[PDB]
Amino acid sequence: KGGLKADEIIAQRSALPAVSVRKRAG
Amino acid sequence: RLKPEGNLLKDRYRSMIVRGKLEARRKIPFRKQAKTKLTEKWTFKDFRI
Amino acid sequence: QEKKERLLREATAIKEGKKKEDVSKKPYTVKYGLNHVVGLIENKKASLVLIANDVDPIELVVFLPALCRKMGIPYAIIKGKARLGTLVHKKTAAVVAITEVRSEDKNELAKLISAVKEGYLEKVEDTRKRWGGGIMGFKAQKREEKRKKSLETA
Amino acid sequence: FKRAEKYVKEYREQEREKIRLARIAKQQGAKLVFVIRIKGINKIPPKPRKILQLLRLRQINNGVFVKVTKATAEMIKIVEPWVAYGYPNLKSVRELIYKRGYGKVNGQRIPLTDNAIIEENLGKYGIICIEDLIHEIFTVGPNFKQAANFLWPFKLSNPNGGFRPRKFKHFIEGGDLGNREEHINALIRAMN
Amino acid sequence: SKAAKGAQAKKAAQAALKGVHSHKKTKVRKSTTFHRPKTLV
Amino acid sequence: SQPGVMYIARLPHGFYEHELRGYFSQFGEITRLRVVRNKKTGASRHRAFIEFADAEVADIAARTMDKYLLFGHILTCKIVPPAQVHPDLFKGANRRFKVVPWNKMAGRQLERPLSESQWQVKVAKEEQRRAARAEKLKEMGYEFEAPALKVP
Amino acid sequence: ALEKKISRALGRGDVSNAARLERNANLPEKTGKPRYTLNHIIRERYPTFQDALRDLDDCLSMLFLFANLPSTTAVPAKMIARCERLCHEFQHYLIVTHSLRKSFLSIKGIYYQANIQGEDILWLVPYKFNQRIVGDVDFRIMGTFVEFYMTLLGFVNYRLYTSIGLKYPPKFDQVKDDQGAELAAFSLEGLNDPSQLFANFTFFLSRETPRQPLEFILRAFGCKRIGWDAVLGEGAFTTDESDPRITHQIIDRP
Amino acid sequence: VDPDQTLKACKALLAHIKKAAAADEESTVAETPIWLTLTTKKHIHDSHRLQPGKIILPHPLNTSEEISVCLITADPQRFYKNAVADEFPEDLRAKIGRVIDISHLKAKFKAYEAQRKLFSEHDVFLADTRIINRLPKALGKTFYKTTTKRPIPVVLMAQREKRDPLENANARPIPEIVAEIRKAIGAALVHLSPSTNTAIKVGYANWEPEKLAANIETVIRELVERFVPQKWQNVRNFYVKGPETAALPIYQTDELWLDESKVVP
RNA sequence: UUCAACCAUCAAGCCCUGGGCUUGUGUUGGGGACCCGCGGCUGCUCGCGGGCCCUGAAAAGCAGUGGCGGGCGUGCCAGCCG
C-alpha cells in the first residue's frame, strides 16, 4: 500500500522501485 | 403443346443398373445415431453462488 | 506473410535511400513469453497480465500473482494456455501481457483494467489465502452423513 | 438464457431502424430488379415485415422479380437491410425460369415442366409458353404483374453447404446495402 | 415453491457466469472391455 | 416472502425498462421496476430500482450482475435493505415515462390566437417591464427612448 | 488432412491461413472442375479413341441431361456451366465438320445421331423445361458419373479440334454469354450434298420455337443466316421480323 | 434601427466594461465578448439546427495570433496535412493547430473525456460539409450543448461508386481552400434553435465602438434578411450586452403581435 | 446462444456561367456560481432558450403534462399526435 484518467489508470503502479537485471541501452 | 413423358435422370440410372455398372440400392433417410448419455460438466456441477 | 511484406517494403526503402523507420510504424502487440513477461513486470512496463490456469509444471507461474501484487500490476488468471496461444499464434502460451496500446484503444484498456480490478481482484482478495482441496468422496460423504444422523438420533 | 448484451444490441438495432424508417417517411420522393431475401436483424418492424409478406420474401434465399416504380422503389428502400437486389440479365432470367421455375395454381407449387400450364394460366393475356413468360418478365410488359404473381418465389441454394468447415456459414453477408446493379448476377450464378 | 425459485435463480446465475453449454455426451458401453481403436495402416 | 429491492446503476444506453424486465425475469419474478428519468427530456439517468417478489432471488441476481462489464459500463448492482428503502420509491413504476415537448407546447402556445383583455394585460405588463429596464438603465449611463405602443 | 488443417485454422481464428489452405483444396464450387483429377483414369479405361467414341453415347446423354439441372452440393453450378461449355464445344465441332446425320423428336426428348470417324453416335437430349429430380435415383453417384464424363469429353473435344486443326479450347465471350449467346459465344479460330441443304436460305425463329436444337440442326446442315426473336438471346443474324432478306420463318402459334 | 443609438450603446457598454474591470485589468478587458441578442415574437426555427450560419464581417473575428484552429476534413487527413504544411500562408499555418479526418476522429475521440480534451485544446473548429452531418454523433453533447465552439461548415469538395481516399481526395484548389478557411474563421456565427432568443458574438471589448456599430448593423441586416422567418414583423427586440453586464436595447418593436391574423374578438 | 461496421466521405434544387445560396434533424447524465431574453404565476417563483466553469461513459425516492386508436374507467402500449 505504501493527461487523461485512462492514462493515469494504465500507468498506475505501486511505490516499490523497479528491478533490473542490467543497464539497458537507451 | 407437347407433354414430355418419363424422367431422363431415372432412365439413365435404370440404364446403369440394367447394364450392371452398379447395383440397385434404396435411399436411407435416417441413419442410426450413436448411443450416448447426457451428463453435466464438472465445472457446472461445482458452480456455487 | 506480414513480416515478409514489411521486410520487402523496408528493403525497398533502404535501396532507394530512406531509413526503415520512414516506412515502418511503431508496433503495438501482445507481449508474451514467460521470461519476457517476468522481465516486463519487474521493470513495471506491463499494464495488464493474464496468466493461464493450467500450466504444468505449476512452478513456472506460482510466483506470478505475488510478483504482480508486489509490483502493482493488475493480473487475472484465465482458463486456457491454448486460448492464449490462439492470441500469440502458438499452440500454448503460459502468460500474456499488455504494456501499451494505441490511442483509439487506450480507453478500452483502462475500462478493462478497472473491470478486472473491481470484478476479480477484490473478489479473490480473501479467497487467495485459503487452502484448497479437502473434498471427500461420494461414498465417504454418504457414510459421514449416515453416522452423523445416527449420532444425532441416538 | 438471453444475455443483457443481446438485449442492448436488439434495442439499439430497433432504435436505429426506427430512425431510418422515420427519415425515409420524411424524405418521401421502369426497370426489372431481382430481389433476394438475406439474413438481417432478428426483430423486424411492422412496416418492413408487412412489405416482406407482400413481396413473398418471408424465407431466406427467396428470389422475386420486381418492376421498378416509385412505390416499389419506396418499398425496396424500406426493406433494404433484409434484401440484396440488382439488375438481372437475360441469362439469369432464362436460367432462373428454366431451372427453378414453379407456378402457382390454386395455391399449390407446380414446376413448369410443359407449356400447357402457362397456356392454361396466362393464355388470356397472350402468354402461351415459357418463352412468352421470359419475354414478359425481361421486357416488363403490360402483364408483368400477372406473370410475376403466377411465378412462385425462387428457392435458391447455399453454395457454402458443400464444404464441411464452412457448413453453417450464410452465403450473402449483410452490410453491403443499396443497389448491386449487375453484380447480383454473380450471386444468381452461384446460388442457382 | 421456494426451492423451485432458488433453483431458477441458480440456473440463471450459472448461465450468466459460465454459459449454456452445461452438458456433455459420453458413450454408452454395453461391455466392460476396452479395445484398441482401429486406425489407418 | 420478504420483498427484495435492488438498485442498479452505470446503465449503458439501451438497457431500459423492457430490457431489464426481460433479462431479470430469467432470474426471478419481477413485481415492480422503475428507471430514473429526467422529466424535462425523458432521457434515462443511468439508474433503476427493481423490486423482486423474493429477497434471496434479488440477492442472487445482484451478486451475479455486480461489477458486470456491459457496453463499456461496469454495472453497479446492490441490494437495499428494507430499513432505508423509501416508501415512495416506486411511484410511476411499471408504466411508460412519456416524453413531452415542452418547447413545442410553449411555441404553439405563443402561436395560439388570444383575446383582447389579456392583450391589454399583456401589453401593460410589457410597459412596466420597459419601466423596470429603464430604471435599471438610469444608473447605467444610458438613455433609450421607447415608441408609444399602440393598442387594438 | 487438408480439411483438418482448414478446420484447425478456422478454430484458431487464422482466417488468412484458412483461405490460403482452402485455395489448395481445389473445390468444385470454385473451379467448376471435379475435385480429383481423372486424367490417368481416362487413359486406363479407354485404351483407344475408338473406345472413347463408342462410350460417347452415354457420355453425351449424361452431360446434355446435366447441363439443364439446378445447382446441388454434388454437382455445383460452376460444374453445370462447365458441362454446358463442353456440350457447346462438341456441338460446334459437329457443326463445323457437318458430322450430324439424323435427328428425331420422341415424346421423351430429341435424339441425335452423328458419325465421327466412322462411329455412329446416338444420344438423347431433354426438352428445355424444368427437369424433376426424384428420390428413386442416386444423385450423388450420378454426379460422380458426370465428373468422369466431363473429364472424358474434355480430352475427346481436344483430340477432335486438334485433328481438324483448330485451337482448343475455343475463344469464349463472357459478355455475350451473359447476354444469352449460348452457342453464339464461341469463336472458332484456326490453329497457328446434304451439308449444303440450307445453304441459300435465311431463317427467322420465333420465340415459341426450340432455339437451341433448331440453331444446331440448321447450322449443322448449312444455314449461315439464322436470326430469331430478341429475347432468345444475342448472336442472331437479324433481330427484326420485318427484314426482307428472311426467306423462311419457324413459327408454332395458332 | 438608427446607427447613432447603436454607437452610443457600444460607447456606454465599453465604458461600463472598463470601469467594472478597473475595480490584470487589460487582460480582464481582453477576451470579453460582445453579444447581440435578438428577441423574436415566435420561434426562429421549428427544430434544432446544429450547423451554424456564417455572416461576413467588415471587421473579422478571431484575428489574434493565439487562436488555435482545429480543422476536420474527409478522409484522408494526410493530403490536408500536406496542404497545411506546404501550400498555406504562414498566418493560417500558425493558426491551424490540428488537422484530423472523420475516421480518426471517430476512432480516437469516442470517449467523453477525449471529447472534452479536444474541446479544451482549441478555440475555433472548422468542418468539411461532406462530413458535418456525422459530427453530432461523433462529438456528442460536449460540442453541441454549448453553441460557442460548434464546428463551422467549410466547403472543401471540388464542385462537379465508392471513393477510395488514397487515390483521390476530391478537393477544390488550395487557394480556394485558403479563402474559404479565412472567410469561415472571420465570419460571425448564428445558431438556429427553437427559441425566441438568439445570441451572436460580434466583437470584443478592446475593439472600437465604430467597429462594433458597423458589425452590429451588418449582422442585423443579413440575419433579419436571411435567417429570420417572416422578416421584420417577426423581430421583437434587439439588445447589446456583455457576459456580466446588462442588456442595452437597440430596436424595440411597436407591434407585439405577429400579424393581423392573430386578431380575434 | 457473435457487445464489429453500416447517415450524405455527397446528392437534389435555384442564379444561368458566377461559383455561390437552400434542403437533406443527426446531442450521455449530473453538479456549481451567475448575467440575461421571452411566457405564465397578483407576485415570489415555475417553464422555454442562451452566457461561464467541473467531470473516468461519473450516478442512491421526489415522476411531470391533454388526447387518437389498440389491450383489459385504467402507475397498459417493443404505436403515435397535441
Residue numbers in the entry:
A (entry chain Ce): 51 to 52, 85 to 108
B (entry chain Ce): 395 to 443
C (entry chain LG): 106 to 259
D (entry chain CM): 51 to 79, 87 to 249
E (entry chain LX): 12 to 52
F (entry chain CI): 184 to 335
G (entry chain CJ): 86 to 277, 362 to 423
H (entry chain CB): 18 to 40, 52 to 188, 204 to 308
Give the text the authors published on this PDB structure.
The rixosome defined in Schizosaccharomyces pombe and humans performs diverse roles in pre‐ribosomal RNA processing and gene silencing. Upon rixosome positioning, the other sub‐module with Las1 endonuclease and Grc3 polynucleotide‐kinase can reach a strategic position at the pre‐60S foot to cleave and 5′ phosphorylate the nearby ITS2 pre‐rRNA.
Colored surface representation of the pre‐5S rotation state with L1 in the inward position (State 5). While the Nop53 C‐domain is always seen embedded into the foot structure of all three nucleoplasmic ct pre‐60S states, its unstructured N‐terminal extension becomes only visible when inserted into the base of the L1 stalk at helix H76 of the 25S rRNA. Although we did not see the density of the AIM motif itself, the positioning of the adjacent upstream and downstream Nop53 N‐terminal sequences defines rather precisely the location of the AIM motif, directly neighboring to the ITS2. This model agrees well with previous observations of a reconstituted S. cerevisiae pre‐60S particle, in which the Mtr4‐exosome was bound to the foot structure arrested at the 5.8S+30 processing step, again with the L1 stalk in an inward position (Schuller et al, 2018). The filtered pre‐60S‐Exo‐14n complex composite map superimposed with the C. thermophilum pre‐5S rotation–L1 inward state (State 5) shown in dark gray and the L1 stalk, 5S rRNA, and Rsa4 in brown, yellow, and green, respectively.
